[PDB]
Design a protein around this ligand. Structure first.
Ligand SMILES: Cc1cc2nc3c(=O)[nH]c(=O)nc-3n(C[C@H](O)[C@H](O)[C@H](O)COP(=O)(O)OP(=O)(O)OC[C@H]3O[C@@H](n4cnc5c(N)ncnc54)[C@H](O)[C@@H]3O)c2cc1C
Lengths: 666, 133, 16
C-alpha cells in the first residue's frame, strides 16, 4: 500500500476510517458530516506519511502545516488538534529523533517507571519528551530486559528477542531507520532431520506438514462450529483438542477398514451361495446323464414311450446345462470382483511412527511460538491476535537486538541495580521502595505522582510476591494475573572456529524421538555473521532443561549436529551460552500466552490503571495512579518487542493525558 | 460451514470420544476387534469356498452332448405326433421344450398343433393331468 | 503466538 494510504496502514490504521481512539478525541468530527471526516482522515494520513518519510527528525506543527495544501491547510485548529493527538499517542515523533524545539527547561509531574525493558524505555522517552520528570528503576545491571544480547569477541547472539516479524506496519520498521540495526532477511527454507541424522524426504515432509495444518483448521472448526469449549467444566486446551481430532482421524481410518472388509464378506458370501447352487447342479446333472445313458442302451427299434424317454432326458440335460453355464458365467464376475477389492484396500494406519514423530516437530513449532505446552494454550483464543500479523520477510538484527534498548536508553535517568520491593500509591501520590541488588539492606524511596509498572508477568505472578502493592491490587486485576499464561522458552548458543553447516540456509529442524522431547533442541539458526548456530529448547522440554547443566546440554547439541553433518565435521565449540528464563528472577519466564480459560480480553485488564480509594472519606474520586505497560498488556501484539514498545507508547500517552491534560479534545 | 476435506467430525462422534478418559481407547479397541473378527470370518469363507471350488473340478465337460442340427419341418409323422402327446403330458405349455423334444418343430407349429388335434388327442384331458402334478 | 512463527508458519485455522 502507498501514498497517504501507505502511511495509515504502516501505522496500523484504516486509511478510510476513523478508529475508536479517534472518535474519543474528535467526537465533533466523527458524529458530524462525512465531508469533514475525509478532510480529517486525510490530514491524519498526510501527517503520518510526513513523519514516516523522515523519522530521524521531529515533526512540528509548523513543518506539518507548511507542507499541507488547500483545502486541507486551511483550517489550522483542525491541523493542530490532529498533529497534537498524533504526537500524544506516539504515532509521530517516537523513538529517537533530533528535536528542533529543545526541551522544556522546567518539568511538570514526576513519574517512576518500574523496569527498563523496552516497554519501559519507550514510555520514558515519551514522557520525557512530554516534559515530565521521569526515572526508571531497573533491577538488572543493563537495560533492555528480555532483550538480551550475548557478546564476546566477535560473537553476537540474542538469548532474548531475535527476530523482527516483518516491517509491514511494524513500529520497529520506524525504529530501524532511526537506529543502526543491521537487518538481514531470513530465508524461509527449513530442512528437517529425524533422529537418525538423515533428512526427511520432500515426499513425507510435505505430506505431514499438510496434515498438521489440516489438523489445525480442524481444531478451529471444533471450537467455533461445534462449540466444543468446555470439558467436564474445564476449558478445553488446544493440546487436548488436537488429540480429539487425531483420535477421530484414527477412528475413521478403522471405520473404513471395517466397511471395505465387510464388502469382501458380503460378496465372498454370494459366492458361497452360488458355489453351493452350482455343486447341486453338477449333482442333478451327473445323475441325469446316468439316466440318459441307461436310456440310450435300449437299442432300437423302440416303442414311442421309450423313444420319448431319450429325447425328454436329452432336453432336460440341455436345460440344466444352459443353467450351469449361466452360473459359471456369474461365478466369473464375482470371482474377479474379489481380486478387485483385495487389490484396493483403504489406508492401513492413520499415521506411522515416523509420521507422528515429524508431526510432533510441528507441534514443537507451536509450543515455541507460544512458549508453552499446547496442553495449556486456550483453544478458542490462543491465536486471537492473528489478524494483526505484519507483512514482509521476518528479519534478524545482525548486530544484536540489545543495540536497541541501549539506543533508547540514551538521554534517560535510569537507576540500574535497583529492585523495587514495594509500590505504595494513594489518593495524594505514590512512593516506591526499592533496594540495591548488590548490598540489599541498603534502601531507596521514590515519591511520584504516578507509577508505570512494566514488571514481567511472571514477576507479577510470584507466589509469594516479589513486589508488594500497597494497597493490594484489586481482585479483578489479580485474577487476570492468575488466569493469563506466562510461558517459557530457552536458547542454546554455539560458537565455532568454522562454518560446518549449510551457509546458505538459516534454519533447520531436528525431529525428536518421543512426543515428550518434541521441543528439545528442535530447531537451529544460522543467522549471524560469525560462525554461530543457535538452538531452541521449547515446550515441556524448556522447563526441564533448566535443571540440567550447560555441558550435558551442549553435549546433546553436538550429538545431534554430528548426527547431521558427520562426527568429525562438528568441532568442540569455542564459546557456549544457555538461557534459563523461568529461573531468572527478573523474568520468571519468557513471554505470555493466552492460557486455557483466559481470553485476549485479559490483556485488556492488564492494561487498566488502578485508582486509589480516597484519603479523607467523602473527598471526591481520585486520579488513577498505577499504570501498566508491557508485552502482557497489549491484546493486539502480545509476547513481542514491537508489542511492548507499543504498550509503552500507549501508557505514556494515557498518563500524559492525565497529568498534563489534553488540549486537543476541545 | 464444514471441516477441512475428508476430516470426519460429526457432533455424535465427538461426544463418544470425550465421554470419559479412555472412552477414546475403548472405542478404538471395539473396532480393532470388530476388524480381526471380520478378518478371520473372511479366511473362513475363503476356506469354505476353496473346498466347493474343487468339487466343481472338470466342470461339466464329461456331460455335454454335441448338437442336433436339424431342419424344421411342416408335416407330422405319426412318430412326431406321439412324441408330442407325451411331451405335453410332461411339459404342459412349455412350448419351447415340447419343440426341443420333438426335434424339428417351431414353437408355433407346436402351438398350432394344440388347436389342431385338440379333440383327437384329448389335449384338454392331457393338460389337466399335467396340473395334477 | 502464531505471529512468533518464522520457520514453517502454521497455516491451519487462519483467515487467509
Ligand atoms: C527467548 C525469547 C525470545 C524472544 N524472541 C522474540 C522475537 O524473536 N521477536 C519479538 O518480537 N519478541 C521476542 N521475545 C519477546 C519479547 O522479548 C518480550 O515481549 C519483550 O522483550 C518484553 O519487554 P517488556 O518491557 O514488556 O518486559 P521486560 O523486557 O521483561 O522488562 C521488565 C524489566 O523489569 C525488570 N524487573 C523485573 N522485576 C523488577 C523489579 N522487581 N524491580 C525493578 N526492575 C524489575 C527486568 O529486569 C526488566 O528490565 C522473546 C522473548 C524471549 C524470552
Amino acid at each position: 500500500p502507498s501514498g497517504v494510504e501507505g502511511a495509515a496502514f504502516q501505522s496500523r490504521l484504516p486509511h478510510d476510517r476513523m478508529t475508536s481512539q479517534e472518535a474519543a478525541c474528535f467526537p465533533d468530527i466523527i458524529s458530524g458530516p462525512q465531508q469533514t471526516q475525509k478532510v480529517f482522515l486525510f490530514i491524519r494520513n498526510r501527517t503520518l506519511q510526513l513523519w514516516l518519510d523522515n523519522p530521524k527528525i521531529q515533526l512540528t506543527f509548523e513543518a506539518t502545516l507548511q507542507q499541507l495544501e488547500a483545502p486541507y491547510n486551511s483550517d489550522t485548529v483542525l491541523v493542530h488538534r490532529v498533529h497534537s493527538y498524533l504526537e500524544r499517542h506516539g504515532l509521530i515523533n517516537f523513538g529517537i529523533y533530533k528535536r528542533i524545539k529543545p526541551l522544556p527547561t522546567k518539568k511538570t509531574g514526576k513519574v517512576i517507571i518500574i523496569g527498563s525493558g523496552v516497554s519501559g524505555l519507550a514510555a520514558a522517552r515519551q514522557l520525557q519528551s512530554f516534559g515530565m520528570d521521569v526515572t526508571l528503576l531497573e533491577a538488572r545491571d543493563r537495560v533492555g530486559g528480555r532483550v538480551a544480547t550475548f557478546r564476546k569477541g566477535n560473537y553476537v547472539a540474542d538469548l532474548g528477542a531475535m527476530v523482527v516479524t516483518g516491517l509491514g506496519g511494524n513500529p520497529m520498521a520506524v525504529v530501524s531507520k532511526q537506529v543502526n540495526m543491521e537487518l538481514a532477511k531470513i530465508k524461509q527454507k527449513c530442512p528437517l532431520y529425524e533422529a537418525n541424522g538423515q533428512a526427511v524426504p520432500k515426499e513425507k515432509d510435505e505430506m505431514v506438514e499438510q496434515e498438521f495444518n489440516r489438523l489445525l483448521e480442524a481444531t478451529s472448526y471444533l471450537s467455533h462450529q461445534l462449540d466444543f469449549n468446555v470439558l467436564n467444566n474445564k476449558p478445553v486446551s488446544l493440546g487436548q483438542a488436537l488429540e480429539v481430532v487425531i483420535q477421530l482421524q484414527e477412528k475413521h481410518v478403522k471405520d473404513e477398514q471395517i466397511e471395505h472388509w465387510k464388502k469382501i464378506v458380503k460378496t465372498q458370501e454370494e459366492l458361497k451361495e452360488l458355489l453351493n447352487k452350482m455343486v447341486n447342479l453338477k449333482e442333478k446333472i451327473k445323475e441325469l446323464h446316468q439316466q440318459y445313458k441307461e436310456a440310450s442302451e435300449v437299442k432300437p427299434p423302440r416303442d414311442i414311450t421309450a423313444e420319448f424317454l431319450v429325447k425328454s432326458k436329452h432336453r432336460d440335460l440341455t436345460a440344466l446345462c444352459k443353467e450351469y453355464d449361466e452360473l459359471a458365467e456369474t461365478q466369473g464376475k464375482l470371482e474377479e470382483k474379489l481380486q478387485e477389492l483385495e487389490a484396493n484396500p483403504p489406508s492401513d494406519v492413520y499415521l506411522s511412527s515416523r509420521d507422528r514423530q515429524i508431526l510432533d516437530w510441528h507441534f514443537a513449532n507451536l509450543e515455541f511460538a507460544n512458549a508453552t505446552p499446547l496442553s495449556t494454550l486456550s483453544l478458542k483464543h490462543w491465536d486471537q491476535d492473528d489478524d494483526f500479523e505484519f507483512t514482509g520477510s521476518h528479519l534478524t538484527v545482525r548486530n544484536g537486538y540489545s543495540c536497541v534498548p541501549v539506543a533508547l536508553a540514551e538521554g534517560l535517568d535510569i537507576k540500574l541495580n535497583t529492585a523495587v520491593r514495594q509500590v505504595r500509591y494513594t489518593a495524594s501520590g505514590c512512593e516506591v521502595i526499592a533496594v540495591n541488588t548488590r548490598s540489599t539492606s541498603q534502601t531507596f524511596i521514590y515519591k511520584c505522582d504516578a507509577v508505570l509498572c512494566t514488571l514481567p508477568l511472571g514477576v507479577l505472578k510470584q507466589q509469594p510476591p516479589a513486589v508488594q502493592f500497597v494497597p493490594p491490587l484489586p481482585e479483578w486485576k489479580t485474577s487476570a494475573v492468575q488466569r493469563m499464561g506466562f510461558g517459557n522458552l530457552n536458547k542454546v548458543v554455539l560458537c565455532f572456529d568454522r562454518v560446518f553447516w549449510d551457509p546458505s540456509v538459516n534454519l533447520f529442524g531436528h525431529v525428536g524421538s518421543t512426543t515428550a522431547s518434541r521441543g528439545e533442541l528442535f530447531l537451529f539458526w544460522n543467522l549471524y555473521k560469525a560462525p554461530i548456530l543457535l538452538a531452541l529448547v521449547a515446550g515441556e522440554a524448556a522447563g526441564i532443561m533448566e535443571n540440567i547443566s550447560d555441558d550435558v546440554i551442549v553435549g546433546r547439541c553436538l550429538a545431534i549436529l554430528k548426527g547431521i553433518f558427520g562426527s568429525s565435521a562438528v568441532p568442540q565449540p569455542k564459546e557456549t551460552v544457555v538461557s534459563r528464563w523461568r529461573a531468572d528472577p527478573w523474568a520468571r519466564g519468557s513471554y505470555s500466552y493466552v492460557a486455557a480459560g483466559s481470553s485476549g480480553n485479559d490483556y485488556d485488564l492488564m492494561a487498566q490503571p488502578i485508582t486509589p480509594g480516597p484519603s479523607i472519606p467523602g473527598a471526591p474520586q481520585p486520579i488513577p495512579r498505577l499504570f501498566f505497560a508491557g508485552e502482557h498488556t497489549i491484546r493486539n501484539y502480545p509476547a513481542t518487542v514491537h508489542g511492548a514498545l507499543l504498550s509503552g507508547l500507549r501508557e505514556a500517552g494515557r498518563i500524559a493525558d492525565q497529568f498534563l491534560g489534553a488540549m486537543y479534545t476541545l | 460451514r464444514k471441516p477441512p476435506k475428508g476430516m470426519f467430525l460429526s457432533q455424535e462422534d465427538v461426544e463418544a470420544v470425550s465421554a470419559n478418559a479412555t472412552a477414546a481407547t475403548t472405542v478404538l479397541r471395539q473396532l480393532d476387534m470388530e476388524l480381526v473378527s471380520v478378518k478371520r470370518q473372511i479366511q473362513n469363507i475363503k476356506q469354505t469356498n476353496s473346498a466347493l471350488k474343487e468339487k466343481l473340478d472338470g466342470g461339466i465337460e464329461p456331460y455335454r452332448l454335441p448338437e442336433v442340427i436339424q431342419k424344421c419341418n411342416a408335416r407330422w409323422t405319426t412318430e412326431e405326433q406321439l412324441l408330442a402327446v407325451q411331451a405335453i403330458r410332461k411339459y404342459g405349455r412349455d412350448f419351447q421344450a415340447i419343440s426341443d423334444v420333438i426335434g424339428n418343430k417351431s414353437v408355433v407349429q407346436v402351438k398350432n398343433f394344440f388347436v389342431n388335434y385338440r379333440r383327437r388327442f384329448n389335449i384338454d384331458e392331457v393338460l389337466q393331468e399335467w396340473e395334477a402334478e | 503466538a502464531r505471529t512468533m512463527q518464522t520457520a514453517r508458519k502454521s497455516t491451519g485455522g487462519k483467515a487467509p
